[PDB]
Amino acid sequence: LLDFDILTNDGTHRNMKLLIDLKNIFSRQLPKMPKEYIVKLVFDRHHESMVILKNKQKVIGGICFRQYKPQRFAEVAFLAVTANEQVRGYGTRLMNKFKDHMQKQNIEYLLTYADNFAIGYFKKQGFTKEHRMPQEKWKGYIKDYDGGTLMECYIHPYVDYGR
């Protein structure tokens, strides 16, 4: 059983529990990223998280992002699937579900400092190292991750990414 949900730091036990479990997966799958730093972003009022759920409560993966509506782009802060569930197509399904939602939120671009060890995954998701969207849009807005490479993905406006 695999579902999806978009979580917000709204102060309820329900979202909090899901968010905490997602945060734990990020730090495990991202040893070098300080948990304190992960917590700072995941629980920040401007960040939302979409998670992959099993049996509607077990978090096996997710994507934490910040939508910049005026510029029509979304910064992907963290992305991960728990080790034991990786390489099964869940990361691809999560991204397609994320693209679908961004498309409905009027977001045209996705930016992210992709982990040097996962650039291959992002390329397979349509991200490129080439900057195409006006750079003044993101410069000074997105966080720079040390061991990451800036990558971007254009959201096709009317294609069906999932449903």
Binding site: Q29, L30, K32, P34, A83, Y113, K143, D146, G147
Partner: peptide
């Protein structure tokens, strides 16, 4: 951040 991983 140190984008390291897995």
């Amino acid at each position: 951040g140190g984008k390291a991983p897995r």
